[model samples]
Target: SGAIYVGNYRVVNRHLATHNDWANLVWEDSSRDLLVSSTTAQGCDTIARCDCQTGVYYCSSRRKHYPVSFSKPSLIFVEASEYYPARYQSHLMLAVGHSEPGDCGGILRCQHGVVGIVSTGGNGLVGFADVRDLLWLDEE
Candidate 1:
């Protein structure tokens, strides 16, 4: 099925701009506040968001979970991707130092605001889909 399913939640509207390697799902619910990042990561700031409220974060690189504290969000950057033009195209994205397999599909909160959504990660960094332009899909 082309429908997007995250955990037990079924996405209502799928943005047409999404690709096989990227997607943006919109749903209506009160699980948490909707946050979007206004600016991209500057490589000198820290960003964080959790899949669960347990204060633990997962790293796909090591395949392990570690105690994490939002008190010190992890440092990250908005690196240029070699797979860009062929992949995200006009889409904006950000990268993190650690791959959060558990946090995929979760929000990436930075000092500026909610910047992106965890999309994919590997090697030493995680990639997030910048959601600034995709936020309006939720209103309809």
Candidate 2:
């Protein structure tokens, strides 16, 4: 758990279903529309929004965006990397599993290096997630 905080991350995959979270996680704190646009092989650039009403973050990219609670994303794994002055901080990522891990058959890949994850339903419909800095050392 001594992985240096080499800042945050942005998954280079559009179909990963985590575009918006990546942006807001690093910079550009959008307050107008908590939405992100993604271009897929099918829908050439579509919008994915976080449903503030139902706590469901969905997109039209695929047939269905897995609707598992994000409130408690199981600690997936960590990779060692260089961030900057600090040297190393645990680069841990979490994921929301179908049946949760260590309990049953549900250790699927949800997301990685994730700093936040939130999702709920019916009542306590308040879930969200974000990130920091070389303070970004291209090391520059």
Candidate 3:
């Protein structure tokens, strides 16, 4: 947990979801959002936003190990490289899975894209299982 200080994060979305150490986390004191950075790692490998009404983070990743989850995604992206910084840091990309080891002669080939899974309730395939990063208003 020895992550170096990167920058301050701001609260782009007011009622997004609940996060651990919500009030006491390493905040940037920008009175907007909280920034979390890691010198070792790059960014969040997977992001899950929770429902303020409920407590379910943005869980779009397929839950193959434990509980049944992540059958659908918002925007799945294909990653060419799995090599990220070793330490704990915020990742810009949110990946779900990768292709097989011998797939494409060891070449990383994954079918990723935001998807809508299952038709729950009286609407489309919608269930609160989403997680994302803070938003930026300005550009460099």
Candidate 4:
């Protein structure tokens, strides 16, 4: 039930599954695909496409790629409001590791590509919805 404004168009949530904590959205204006990489799995250098039939954004790559190392500390860029700053935790979903409040729904990115979407944060932790999960929404 979340919504965001992109220019004059309003994008709203259309589909979601709690098991993966990921959701799909729709907007009135034209949109393009998102370039992203898989987390903890194979390295992915591709775009997340919006399916014409289902309107779901997902990646469709079966080719093997390099390994993505999550354990190595790296700088992660979060496209969110800078009003709040806090440390984050690394997990299936990248999470914040502090008690300070932070913003959600921000785009998580790295030098490789888009990582995920900020899902929940607060109470000493912030979590992100993995791009891989978004890439698999069509299976649902």
Candidate 5:
């Protein structure tokens, strides 16, 4: 297979992305890409179409636009990875987290005046992660 384009986002210091709340945001084993699950989380999960070529993440999440917040992915490095914060103004970025068990995903939302960072999918739980991009796919 070729390089599977995960998706795209609007231009910003940190770009913003979206996923259908009812979809399972899975890390493709084959593609190593962050993608919206085509399969339903259960049977009633709302699946939507996203056009990354246009940088539009249209879905059922609360964050349907930019200058908002969502359960986005952040590059948190305690040691090796380079943490790039939104240098200019403020940009929307994608946050990726994991479910305790099965396949579940997050969504985008607007918080009036707040910036979202890393999400652990739950409270008081230490989520799985790669701190310094030790894994090849995780490298910046």
Candidate 6:
């Protein structure tokens, strides 16, 4: 039940991971290892936490210590999945993709940045992917 974590950024890329589709991004489903989904679109969501193999699946709760996890995991305004280029750097950052060093419960989920890439100890993972609640388009 592990090997999950996807973030192929889209809506356009540029700069150190530009971003767009604005409006508070945050879509998670990371964890559960390799839990990918693509019902035809919706920005091809994907995200998971833990099991990066040591990077640590985030641990800093107990009243907000800034370690609650989630330095990335976007889903705001929708529209993503790599393939950005409208002048390169449109806006909508978090451009890291394809990862899964080991295994774990998976599922970190996000709505901002930090896609697929576990740095501390090489854990390798990222979250924000909660599907199954479609039907909602019109923000701006």
Quick one: best lDDT, which candidate? 1
Please, what are the lDDT tens digits per residue for candidate 3 over residues 1-78? 011121332222112213633553433422221233222324322222321221221222322211122332233222
Residue range 2-120, candidate 4, lDDT tens digits:
22222222222112212222222321111111222112233223323421111111211212122222222223443332332343323224343321212333444455344543444
For each candidate, the alpha-carbon lDDT, in order, equals 0.35, 0.24, 0.23, 0.30, 0.23, 0.25
Flag regions of model 3 displaced more than 4 Å: 1-27, 30-33, 43-45, 48-52, 56-133, 136-140
Per-residue lDDT of candidate 1, residues 1-140 (tens digit): 01222232232212222342223323322111122222121223223232322233334445554442232222243333332222322232434356544445444444433444444455765544444334343332
Local lDDT at 59 for model 6 = 17
All candidates' TM-scores? 0.35, 0.20, 0.18, 0.31, 0.20, 0.19
lDDT at 84 for candidate 6?
Answer: 20
Question: Superposing all C-alpha atoms, what RMSD in Å does each candidate have to the true structure?
Answer: 12.1, 14.4, 15.9, 15.3, 14.5, 14.4
- Of 3 and 4, the candidate ahead on TM-score is 4
Which model scores highest in TM-score? Answer: 1
CA lDDT, candidate 1, residue 116: 42
Mark the regions of model 5 whose C-alpha exceeds 4 Å error after superposition. 1-33, 36-73, 77-99, 111-140
* Candidate 6 lDDT score relative to the true structure: 0.25
**Clashing pairs in model 2?**
3-88, 3-89, 4-88, 4-89, 5-89, 6-83, 134-137
Local error of candidate 3 at 73, Å? Answer: 23
Candidate 1 TM-score, true structure as reference: 0.35
- Clash totals in order: 1, 7, 29, 3, 9, 57
When 1 and 2 are scored with lDDT, the better candidate is 1
Over 11-80, each residue of candidate 2 has an lDDT whose tens digit, in order, gives: 2211122546455543322221122222222321112222221223332223233444433322222222
